[PDB]
Design a protein around this ligand. Structure first.
Ligand code: VF1
Ligand code: CLR
Ligand code: OLC
Ligand code: OLC
Lengths: 118, 296
């Protein structure tokens, strides 16, 4: 049905930056939300944005460091993560709404904040 | 040159003086209450962690300071004279110019911010940070200082037919620099803001109307109706509230008009309309903001 393609994850040193992107190239859904699950924690809301791309909503834990945007022309969702800490190490999931809580979820992308990176 | 002191010869009637008094009082009370409520909700609940709340707080603070000058202007109208002295004349005039521009520049920034979000979503990732929102507020304050600081030096009290006018004194020749100030105010506080918000919101709507989503065209038409409606409201409110006083100031610089009751009442009504923009901005930009709405 819907295939959410997540990109941009991986390893970063603490204080570094990552940009996640998520697309549904078939236009069958609107990627609009970002969630994450730490290794031992529950799934937690990170950020979301309206269909228009105008109004983002951030979790208090990331409001000072994360920015989200939506390219309405090509249905791409972005998450810019700055000043990454260890508490940001998690699998990040893209969430999308059908054109007709979210209806679709990506398989997730690992984000690991460690000093053993470059 | 006359400024605060209005040539009123032909003492006002009962109904007109009460009307102008109720005008200044209502706009002041509504402006102070609405903007202090926004600042309270931000300080107490939302906490100003996001760029949007940083802009909203900056707008509410400027709008509250703008309406805080109205009790001085009311008394100045009652007594037909500025009674607060030279120091308060400089302070109130400077606060009044500073926060006219700070209010207007902030609502322009909110228009540019929304235009960037829709039309440059990649660059929006860098622009729409709390750090940049604070930088923009500082840059806008520096720009507002180009007029807010000089009027602090130019403003003074001088005698005018026994009564006292809190006015501005200019370098020689006065007829050049006084009219240059009026022109610069007209273009930085009205012309440029009208151009910025109409072009930014217009280009934002054009981009949103160009998306074709293979499925839910009804959900797209619905959101476009709501956004276009909000765009028309915030632009119409700015134009209705600010055009009368700006045009009135220009006309009085060009021609001499017959001092009548209708001229006097219309002048103070146009002044009040300008401060009503500070009364409506909490509704348009705070209470109707998507995230601010949820926190109520
Ligand atoms: C000409 O008198 C004013 C007319 C509207 C105005 C307030 C004023 C009544 C006046 C003023 C400002 C502060 C204290 C006393 C008088 N300063 C002028 C203000 C000064 C700024 N404030 C917001 C309004 C709007 C305005 C618009 C254009 C302009 O050239 C001047 C003004
Ligand atoms: C909705 C917006 C665009 C309407 C703009 C209203 C403007 C054009 C109106 C509002 C008040 C009007 C003024 C009110 C009264 C007079 C009296 C007269 O002695 C000179 C014209 C003058 C000064 C009018 C000029 C035009 C004026 C400034
Ligand atoms: C942007 C709104 C532009 C509105 C401009 C309206 C100007 C109307 C005008 O110039 O009024 C003429 C005056 O009343 C003659 O005495
Ligand atoms: C808004 C930009 C256009 C407004 C026009 C800016 C100049 C305002 C018009 C002033 C004017 O036309 O003066 C009226 C004249 O005195 C009548 O006889």
């Amino acid at each position: 049905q819907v295939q959410l393609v997540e990109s941009g994850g991986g390893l970063v040193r603490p204080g570094g930056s990552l940009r996640l992107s998520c697309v549904d190239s078939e236009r069958t859904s609107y990627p609009m939300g970002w969630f994450r699950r730490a290794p031992g924690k529950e799934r937690e809301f990170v950020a979301s944005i309206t269909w228009s791309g105008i109004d983002p909503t951030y979790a208090d834990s990331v409001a000072d460091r994360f920015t989200t945007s939506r390219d309405v022309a090509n249905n791409t969702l972005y998450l810019q993560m700055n000043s990454l800490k260890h508490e940001d190490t998690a699998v990040y999931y893209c969430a999308a709404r059908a054109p007709v809580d979210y209806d679709y979820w990506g398989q997730g992308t690992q984000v690991t904040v460690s000093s053993a990176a470059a | 040159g006359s400024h605060s002191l209005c040539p009123q010869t032909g003492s006002p009637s009962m109904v007109t003086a009460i009307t102008i008094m109720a005008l200044y009082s209502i706009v002041c009370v509504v402006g102070l209450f609405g903007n202090f409520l926004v600042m309270y909700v931000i300080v107490r609940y939302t906490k100003m962690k996001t760029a949007t709340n940083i802009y909203i707080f900056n707008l509410a603070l400027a709008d509250a300071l703008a309406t805080s000058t109205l009790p001085f202007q009311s008394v100045n109208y009652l007594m037909g004279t500025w009674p607060f002295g030279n120091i308060l004349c400089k302070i109130v005039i400077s606060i009044d110019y500073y926060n006219m521009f700070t209010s207007i520049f902030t609502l322009c920034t909110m228009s540019v911010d929304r235009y960037i979000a829709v039309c440059h979503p990649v660059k929006a990732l860098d622009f729409r940070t709390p750090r940049n929102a604070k930088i923009v507020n500082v840059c806008n304050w520096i720009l507002s200082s180009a007029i807010g600081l000089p009027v602090m030096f130019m403003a003074t009290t001088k005698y005018r037919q026994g009564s006292i006018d809190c006015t501005l004194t200019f370098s020689h020749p006065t007829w050049y620099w006084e009219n240059l100030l009026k022109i610069c105010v007209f273009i930085f506080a009205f012309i440029m803001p009208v151009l910025i918000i109409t072009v930014c919101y217009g280009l934002m709507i054009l981009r949103l109307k160009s998306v074709r989503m293979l499925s839910g065209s009804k959900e797209k038409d619905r959101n476009l109706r709501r956004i276009t409606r909000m765009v028309l409201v915030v632009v119409a409110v700015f134009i209705v509230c600010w055009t009368p006083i700006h045009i009135y100031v220009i006309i009085k610089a060009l021609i001499t008009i017959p001092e009548t009751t209708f001229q006097t009442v219309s002048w103070h009504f146009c002044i009040a309309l300008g401060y009503t923009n500070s009364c409506l901005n909490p509704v348009l930009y705070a209470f109707l903001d998507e995230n601010f709405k949820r926190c109520f």
